[PDB]
Amino acid sequence: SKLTVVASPLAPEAVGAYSQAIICNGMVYCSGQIGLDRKTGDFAGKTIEEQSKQVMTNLKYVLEEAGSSMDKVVKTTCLLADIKDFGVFNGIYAEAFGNHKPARACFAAAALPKGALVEVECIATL
Amino acid sequence: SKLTVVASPLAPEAVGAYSQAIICNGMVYCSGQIGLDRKTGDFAGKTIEEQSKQVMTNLKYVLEEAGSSMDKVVKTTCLLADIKDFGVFNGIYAEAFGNHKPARACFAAAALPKGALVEVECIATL
Amino acid sequence: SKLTVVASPLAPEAVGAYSQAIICNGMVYCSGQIGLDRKTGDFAGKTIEEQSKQVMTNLKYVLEEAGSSMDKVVKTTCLLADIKDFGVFNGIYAEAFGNHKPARACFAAAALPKGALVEVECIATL
Ligand SMILES: [Cl-]
Ligand SMILES: [Cl-]
Ligand SMILES: [Cl-]
């Protein structure tokens, strides 16, 4: 039951107390992505649309680096800064996954790290 | 590591970007149930008691459809719209599980989808 | 796929509808620890620093009882009562894990059980 650290050069860098994802026993446990662009270290934009798209892109990068894929995602958890953003977020999430339909839980947090508007974590299979 | 979609006709319908649950590698990953009654597509009631009972019933339906059970639940996460609802919720949760005692985390969200008062997700074994 | 209940005498007692952790299929699913001291049944202190240290100590006790360890943690979820506590919390978390870097998601809840300032759950391997 080895743990393998996942570090994509495309996803936001993990330089603190966490890894982008950990592989263990055939599963990939992904950190909660926020909508940072690795190229800038800043949010992709100020809007929910911009950050949501970036979050889903980031997740894909992490999953690919792990040897997984969006289609191998079993469960996500979707955190919003503001519940009114649910509809917009959900559309962008759905585009990202296409016809694949993970299990899901969603909620509005009181606040997210770094003032993010959206954070999405997941678990996937190899 | 096939994924199997769980769709009970008894639990709220999943007609959007998620599945009620996903089976993978011997485990069942359940979406966060809210207190909708599949027969109406509406909340079972306006109160915490009514919605909490519905949520736990819904979870049982999903688990059964997956080939699992309440007694096979390993971990839940219990989300409340209002922290003051913890005691009432907890009683209803406990009734639902009987002597089975999953691992658990609970918190109050700033808000939940659809204005729900309570949302409960879980992971279970086959 | 037997479930085993984990009950450390060092971690806060689980006397209600949950277990400290559940072992299943080679993995340990840990409840969200709050900063209670088992010796008193009360918070270790009123501050974020005091409770955060207690939470990480509690997690270690649970993991050890399960046959796991801090180094075997694959993923955590870190819940704060107040987003401004993120930096302090993160330092204490990092001390606790040393060079081990789980996957992670963090957020501020609207509120936590018992008025806690911080709650941390995790999943680990045997
Ligand atoms: Cl997740
Ligand atoms: Cl859960
Ligand atoms: Cl976790």
In order of their start, the domains of chain C are 1-126 (3.30.1330.40)
Task: Mention every residue, 6+ apart, whose C-beta is less than 8 A from residue B31.
Answer: A75, A103, A104, A105, B14, B18, B19, B20, B21, B62, B121
Torsion of CA C90, C91, C93, C94, to 10 degrees: 110
Amino acid (1-letter code) at residue C96: A
Angle, nearest 10°, between helix axes A86-97 and A48-65? 30
CB-side neighbour CA atoms (13 Å) of B94: 11
What distance in Å separates the CA atoms of residue C2 and residue C14, rounded to the nearest whole number? Answer: 20
CA nearest to B120, candidates C58, A112, B86: B86
The pair of structure tokens assigned to C26 is 């080679």
Contact C76, C102 (CB under 8 A): yes
Q: Which ligand is nearest to the CA of C32?
A: 3
Ligand 2 center from residue A46 Cα (angstroms): 31
What distance in Å separates the CA atoms of residue C109 and residue A79, rounded to the nearest whole number? Answer: 11
Dmax (CA) for chain C in angstroms is: 41
What distance in Å separates the CA atoms of residue B33 and residue A78, rounded to the nearest whole number? Answer: 14
Give how far the C-alpha of residue A77 lies from the chain's centroid of Cα atoms, to the nearest Å: 9
Intra-chain end-to-end CA distance of chain A, in Å: 14
Q: Do C79 and B105 touch (CB under 8 A)?
A: yes
Which chain C residues are closer than 8 Å to A14 by Cβ?
101
Backbone angles phi, psi at A44, to 5 degrees: -60, -30
Task: For residue A96, give the 3-state DSSP assignment.
Answer: helix
Amino acid (1-letter code) at residue C93: Y
What distance in Å separates the CA atoms of residue A116 and residue C82, rounded to the nearest whole number? Answer: 15
CA nearest to C48, candidates C79, C88, C104, C78: C88
Task: Mention every residue, 6+ apart, whose C-beta is less than 8 A from residue A86.
Answer: A80, A106, A108, B113
Q: Measure B116 CA to nearest chain A CA, in Å.
A: 10
Contact A78, A120 (CB under 8 A): yes
SS3 content of chain B, % helix, strand, coil (to 5): 30, 35, 35
Which chain B residues are closer than 8 Å to C21 by Cβ?
103
Ligand 3 center from residue C75 Cα (angstroms): 5
Experimental technique of record: X-ray
Helix (H) / strand (E) element for C42: namely: strand C42-43
Torsion of CA B56, B93, B117, A88, to 10 degrees: -60
Contact C8, C65 (CB under 8 A): yes
Task: Mention every residue, 6+ apart, whose C-beta is less than 8 A from residue B39.
Answer: none
Residues pairing with C124 in the sheet: C28, C73
Q: Which ligand is nearest to the CA of B77?
A: 2
Residues pairing with C106 in the sheet: C78
Burial class (CB in 10 A: 0-12, 13-18, 19+), C106: buried
Active site residues of A: 106
Q: Do C83 and A111 touch (CB under 8 A)?
A: yes
Which chain C residues are closer than 8 Å to B108 by Cβ?
109-112
State which residue of chain C sits closest to B87, comparing Cα positions: C113
Task: Mention every residue, 6+ apart, whose C-beta is less than 8 A from residue A91.
Answer: none
Task: For residue B63, give the 3-state DSSP assignment.
Answer: helix
Contact B112, A108 (CB under 8 A): yes
- Beta strands at A103-108 and A42-43: parallel, antiparallel or unpaired: unpaired
Q: Do B112 and A109 touch (CB under 8 A)?
A: no
